């Protein structure tokens, strides 16, 4: 029915003489150049649509800015979700994300996946051990032979991580960044549409009446800009949490299962290689055995900081590690 870009158009209007009115019905917003969509509360809708006496005008303005900031800075902190501690509930209603009708519900059941319009390729192919099997095949056993095999194994873990993180960088964050980029738009639209409904009423006030109080829209718009900045802070925090969440719970584990399988196979190989050739050490190979056993028994730690210099992403990842 409605893509993200339609909701974002429901939230626009052409400058005109008419009084424009916010509405919670998306369909209604689109079919009328006067009606504008909002993800704000029905209480907020009512409060702006209602026509306002000249006396109660500045007091009106006060409440809307309070209501704006209340609605915008909304923050749920339900901690039923893994590695997402903050939610911004109005995101879905604003961009048709969690309506793709309970958002926060949607995150709790399905995780951060629900932000992606396009699910990336998650499967990691089987990692074979043929290259190393061939490498040691009729090689006289030495310390360096075993150490090479093990550096190669390290390198493999490094390759799979790089693969996964890059997939994530390219296909996931770009998508999420789009939500961020667009959320800023939706919020800025709502500011422009409220500034419009207000400055409409004020320009129906008689000049002697109007002359009494000065509109000072550069004050208003400005106060609306700071309320948004505060909202983007919540949104960004949230988004980066979701990013690292998806990465660590829904992407990296697939690599790690495969890498573990790889270590395992390599282990068998090398230990057999060492026993088959123990006679080069007059039969005493206990150290070499212990080396491959220790090395391959522990996963190579994943450091997001290899790939990313971002402040937000790395701290979110730091929080992940405990």
Residue numbers in the entry: 547 to 646, 650 to 871
Per the authors:
Interestingly, diffraction-quality crystals of tHNA could only be obtained at an acidic pH despite thorough crystallization screens at various pH. We suspected that the isolated tHNA domain may be prone to adopting the acidic pH conformation needed for LC translocation, and its neutral pH conformation could be stabilized by LC/A and/or HCA. Taking advantage of our new crystal structure, we set out to look for point mutations on tHNA that shift the structural equilibrium of tHNA more towards the neutral pH conformation as opposed to the acidic pH conformation. After extensive search and screening, we found that tHNA carrying a single point mutation of F658E could be crystallized at pH 8.5 and we determined its structure at 3.02 Å. This result is consistent with our structural analysis that suggested F658E may destabilize the acidic pH conformation, but does not directly affect the neutral pH conformation. We found that the structure of tHNAF658E is highly similar to the corresponding region in full-length BoNT/A that was crystallized at a neutral pH (root-mean-square deviation of ~0.96 Å). Notably, the BoNT-switch adopts an almost identical structure in tHNAF658E and the full-length toxin. Taken together, the structures of tHNA at pH 5.1 and tHNAF658E at pH 8.5 allow us to directly visualize how the environmental pH regulates the conformation of the BoNT-switch. BoNT/A1F658E has a ~5-fold decreased toxicity, which is likely due to the energetic costs of burying of an acidic residue in a hydrophobic pocket when tHNA transits into the acidic-pH conformation during LC translocation.
